[model samples]
Target: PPGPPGPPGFPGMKGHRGFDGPPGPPGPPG
Candidate 1:
């Protein structure tokens, strides 16, 4: 009698594995 509460945190919490290759350009090598 309860099936409509998912998206504010997740089924059990732990859903955010994004953004791992889009910000790398700062350093010195010469």
Candidate 2:
């Protein structure tokens, strides 16, 4: 289908609640 171009454009999906966001992720480059 594509050519090694699927991840660099996925994590930006969305995340503003819980896990690695709220009261989370405070180490290892967080």
Candidate 3:
């Protein structure tokens, strides 16, 4: 019952899906 130890890996925080920006050439009724 010891609450105060969550910073090292923090539940293995590994969810960074941020990299999808290369498809923008269809504007104006294409």
Candidate 4:
């Protein structure tokens, strides 16, 4: 009893930030 609740997609296009690693070496001070 579930066939009338699905009609809202195609809304996702803008995500490309892989391999992001450039902010380290700032510890030992607490």
Candidate 5:
């Protein structure tokens, strides 16, 4: 009966406020 509230992971930035951020997959850093 546990299936009715699943919608909030990184569940923000509706304003794209995962905001003030950028870039990824740039591995291998000394």
Candidate 6:
């Protein structure tokens, strides 16, 4: 009995949950 070469790993990923940029000029009176 011989067993070998199992399970290649999964690749990584990237994610974002909110705004990712320049924004919001001038906000008042809330």
lDDT of each: 0.79, 0.60, 0.81, 0.91, 0.69, 0.82
Which of 2 and 4 is the better model by TM-score?
Answer: 4
Tally clashing residue pairs in candidate 3: 0
Candidate 6 local Cα displacement, residue 1, angstroms: 2.3
What is every candidate's alpha-carbon RMSD to the true fold? 8.1, 14.9, 6.6, 8.5, 13.0, 5.3
TM-score of each: 0.20, 0.14, 0.20, 0.21, 0.15, 0.25
Among the numbered candidates, top lDDT falls to 4
lDDT tens digits, residue span 1-30, model 3: 899976765476788999998998878974
Write down the TM-score for model 2.
0.14
Residue pair clashes in candidate 4: none
lDDT winner between candidates 1 and 3: 3
The residue-by-residue lDDT of candidate 2 on 1-30, one tens digit each, is 668755455455685676564575567863
Write down the TM-score for model 5.
0.15
Pairs with steric clashes in candidate 2 = none
lDDT of 5 by residue, 1-30 (tens): 677987768744456345655777889989
User: Where is model 2 more than 4 Å wrong at Cα?
Assistant: 1-11, 19-30
Error of 3 at 5 (Å): 15
| Model 1 RMSD vs true structure | 8.1
Error of 5 at 17 (Å): 14
- Best first by lDDT, ranked: 4, 6, 3, 1, 5, 2
Q: Residues 1-30, candidate 4: write the lDDT tens digits.
A: 779988999999999879879899999999
Worst 10 residues of 4 by lDDT: 14-23
Residue 6 miss distance in model 1 (angstroms): 24
